[PDB]
Amino acid sequence: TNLCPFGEVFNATRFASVYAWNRKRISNCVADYSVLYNSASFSTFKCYGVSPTKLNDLCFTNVYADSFVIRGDEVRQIAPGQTGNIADYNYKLPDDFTGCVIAWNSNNLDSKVGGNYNYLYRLFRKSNLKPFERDISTEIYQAGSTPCNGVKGFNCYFPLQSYGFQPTYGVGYQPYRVVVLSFEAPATVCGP
Amino acid sequence: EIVLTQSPGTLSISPGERATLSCRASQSVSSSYLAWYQQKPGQAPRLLIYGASSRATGIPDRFSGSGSGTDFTLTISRLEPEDFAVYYCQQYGSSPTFGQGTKLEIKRTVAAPSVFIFPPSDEQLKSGTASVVCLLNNFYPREAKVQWKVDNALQSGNSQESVTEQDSKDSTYSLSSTLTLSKADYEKHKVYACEVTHQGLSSPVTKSFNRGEC
Amino acid sequence: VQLVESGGGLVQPGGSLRLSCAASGITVSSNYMNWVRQAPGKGLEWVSLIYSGGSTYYADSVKGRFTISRDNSKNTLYLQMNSLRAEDTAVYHCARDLVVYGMDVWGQGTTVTVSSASTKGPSVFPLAPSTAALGCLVKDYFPEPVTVSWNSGALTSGVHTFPAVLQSSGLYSLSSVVTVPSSSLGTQTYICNVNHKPSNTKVDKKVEP
Ligand SMILES: *[C@@H]1O[C@H](CO)[C@@H](O)[C@H](O)[C@H]1NC(C)=O
């Protein structure tokens, strides 16, 4: 009978960097997904394998709400079957994804004159992430045959890059807050 | 997608002076993905600046970069002879894109071309084609207009041009333009003329010949 | 640290060609790697990119025709080019991309020529004087290059040998000129020596008024 704590996710003051994406497990509660879809405060609300309207009539064992910040031109990568810096090295959705991807412009909260250096992404990785894999490692990347031993230099690079969000950037370089709802024993979360 | 436009297309300066090369992006973008490259004649491109303002390893101190948003700048503070080359800016959005390049050339005083016109040879005529050639020799600056005229009809679409590289001793250019006609068409007209426009000429210079007159 | 491109050559339109880039001092499979090409007298054009993790991307002008790949055990990057077109004629460079740190390592490049033309030696015609100018028109040859000298190398002052132009026939053509004192037209012999090695054609053409 309790409402699902969606407000803690969508209205959080701080969001995580994509490399260190947050996951909120939703359990034992009731959820109005049409209320979310009816806010219309979203530039992206794409549902895969389900209908936003029919979500209010379904039940699931576990709902996950993943949350992070990326740039506008990278929102397209938050979808099944996609490739790119985010999908390959930061946040990967499965090809059979059953859930919803919601995004909104956050230039008013996440950008700063002089640059916000708090939001980062992984630029350097040897291999692709598996679906729902989180890599928070900060080890020096070896681009050559010589081991780096924690020392930056030729062929030895820090793996993370700041987005440096500035308000004067175009929409593609501007910050976007993203919430991925994943719908998965007994059901615990249901709609009305 | 980001489009990079460099300016000016050609920059003409002397050794020891300061060069300012510009790169304009079609949208406001992050400076961390802006790079500048030098390409000397015959050689591969060479990284000069990355992240808009960071000098690459081993690059001399007189190269520096700056800018933000849509406007980026490469500054070469005290030109050396080896710096006269082509420069490209480059942005990485989701993949690399390059500007169209700025040529840095040696500046000198205006020098007007000497102009020569050559009829087709009798030997070439035997084989059914006539090439008429107009030479513009040792001029500066590079901008020059060749207008072919046949019996005073201006010709369009039947000529090709090529230009030498700046001369290492007098810093001039030379230009050759070839008008190509079939022999049958060549024989229908009398006066073949090359009209040349250039800053060093007060009025255009026309060189001509009459077909069949020695 | 170097990248060495191989495999460039002459191909007919519609044909295929595989370029290779052998690396030392970087590991291809650990890097963002690009192919970047430069058509004659034109600027740099990004062609293709492969991520360390295997994702690939292509310029719209080569999409569906080119495939970038690599062999880790040979530390080598490849570009397979199918359905080649005349506009694909260019020098192809491999480069290691650091994204935020630029393309720091570049190969010297390998030249690809796409054309329907068959090998053909040039016709050499005089550009006869009427400071005097004279020259040789070196017409209708394939492939590049030709070499031109004057009086077997004895005359270099005032010589301009122009870049070849590609004609609409697919054959090349160039002019070589020299300016001389008009008083020497009556006293000096001028001979342009044209060499086209692909056809084993050598021509010595005397040019007179
Ligand atoms: C976020 O806050 C707004 C205004 O305080 C509220 O109306 C909205 O319901 C909240 N979002 C969610 C998903 O609860």
Same domain, C139 and C57: no
Domain boundary among C87, C112, C137: C112
**Which residue precedes each gap in chain A (C to N above 2.5 Å)?**
184
**Residues contacting residue A177 through CB under 8 Å, at least 6 positions apart:** A15, A67, A68, A69, A103, A104, A106, A109, A110
Q: What is the b/e burial string over B75-89, where b = at least 16 CB atoms within 10 angstroms of the residue's CB?
A: ebeebeeebbbbbbb
Same domain, C17 and C80: yes
Q: State the greatest distance between any 2 C-alpha atoms of chain B, in Å, as a whole number.
A: 67
Residues of A in contact with B29 (CB under 8 A): 169-170, 173
Residue C51's CB is within 10 A of a number of other CB atoms, namely 20
For atom 10 of ligand 1, the residue with the nearest CA is A7
Least Cα distance to C55 among B28, A128, A111 occurs for: A128
Instruction: Identify whether the C-beta of residue B209 lies closer than 8 Å to the C-beta of residue B133.
Output: no
Least Cα distance to B92 among C87, A120, A175, A73 occurs for: A73
Residues of B in contact with C99 (CB under 8 A): 33, 92
- Phi, psi for C92 (deg, rounded to 5): -105, 125
CA C176/CA C192 separation, integer angstroms: 8
Instruction: Identify whether the C-beta of residue A128 lies closer than 8 Å to the C-beta of residue A11.
Output: no
CA A89/CA C2 separation, integer angstroms: 27
Nearest to C26 among A88, A125, A143 (CB): A143
Residues in chain C: 209
Residues C4/C23/C42/B50 CA torsion (nearest 10 deg)? -140
Least Cα distance to C51 among C71, C68, C74, C73 occurs for: C68
Same domain, C136 and C98: no
Strands (DSSP E) contained in chain B are 4-7, 10-13, 19-29, 34-39, 46-50, 54-55, 63-76, 86-92, 96-98, 102-106, 114-118, 129-139, 145-150, 153-154, 159-163, 173-182, 191-197, 205-210
Least Cα distance to B33 among C40, A108, C98 occurs for: C98
**Residues contacting residue A47 through CB under 8 Å, at least 6 positions apart:** A55, A99, A100, A101
Residue-range definition of the domain harbouring residue C166: 123-207
Chain C closest-CA separation from residue B100 CA (Å): 6
Ligand 1 atom nearest residue A7's Cα:
14
Domain boundary among C79, C112, C145: C112
Least Cα distance to A19 among A116, A138, A151, A103 occurs for: A138
CA B17/CA B100 separation, integer angstroms: 24
CA B133/CA B180 separation, integer angstroms: 9
- Phi, psi for C57 (deg, rounded to 5): -145, 150
Least Cα distance to A78 among A96, A98, A55, A102 occurs for: A102
Q: Give the Å distances, CA to CA, from B180 to B177, B185, B196.
A: 10, 10, 18
Same domain, C138 and C62: no
Indicate the SS3 state at residue C3.
Answer: strand
Same domain, C133 and C98: no
Same domain, C26 and C49: yes
Same domain, C159 and C198: yes
CA B171/CA B142 separation, integer angstroms: 10
Residue C108 counted as domain residue = yes
What's the start-to-end Cα distance of chain A, in Å? 10
Q: Which domains does chain B have, with CATH numbers?
A: 4-106 (2.60.40.10), 114-210 (2.60.40.10)
Chain A closest-CA separation from residue B49 CA (Å): 16
| Ordered DSSP codes for chain A | -PBP--HHHHT-SS--BGGG-EEEEE-SEE--HHHHHTT---SEEEEESS-TTGGGG-EES-EEEEEEEEEGGGGGGSSTT--SHHHHHT----TT--EEEEEEE-HHHH--TT-B-S-EEE---SSPPPTT------PPEE-SSS--TT--BTTEE-SEEE--B-TTS-GGGSEEEEEEEEE-----EE--
CATH code at position C135: 2.60.40.10
Residues of C in contact with A123 (CB under 8 A): 99-100
Same domain, C12 and C51: yes
Residues of A in contact with B94 (CB under 8 A): 73, 84-85
Tokens for A160, please give them: 């993370």
Same domain, C15 and C79: yes
Same domain, C94 and C12: yes
CB of B84 within 8 Å of a chain C CB? The answer is no
Tokens for A140, please give them: 């020096």
Amino acid found at A3: L
Residues of C in contact with A145 (CB under 8 A): 27
Residue C118 counted as domain residue = no
Domain boundary among C54, C89, C112: C112
The count of domains in chain C is 2
Tell me which method was used to determine the 3D structure. X-ray
Residue C155 CA from chain centroid, whole number: 27
**What are chain C's partners, defined as 3 or more CB pairs within 8 angstroms?**
A, B
Interface touch B29/A170, C-beta < 8 Å: yes
Counting one residue from B and one from C, how many pairs have CB atoms under 8 Å apart?
133
Residue C31 counted as domain residue = yes
Q: Which chain B residue is nearest to residue C101, measuring alpha carbons?
A: B50
Least Cα distance to C164 among C189, C190, C145 occurs for: C145
Residue B184 DSSP label = H
From the CA atom positions of chain B, what is the Rg in Å? 22
Residue A192 CA from chain centroid, whole number: 27
Q: Which chain A residue is nearest to residue C23, measuring alpha carbons?
A: A144
Instruction: Identify whether the C-beta of residue B18 lies closer than 8 Å to the C-beta of residue B64.
Output: no
Best residue in B30, B161, B162 to probe C by mutation, most C CBs within 10 Å? B162
Nearest to C102 among B50, B161, B180 (CB): B50
CA C186/CA C129 separation, integer angstroms: 11
Residue C41 counted as domain residue = yes
Indicate the SS3 state at residue C46.
Answer: strand
Best residue in B118, B132, B159, B183 to probe C by mutation, most C CBs within 10 Å? B118
CA B6/CA B15 separation, integer angstroms: 22
Q: Which chain A residue is nearest to residue B29, measuring alpha carbons?
A: A169
Residue C27 counted as domain residue = yes
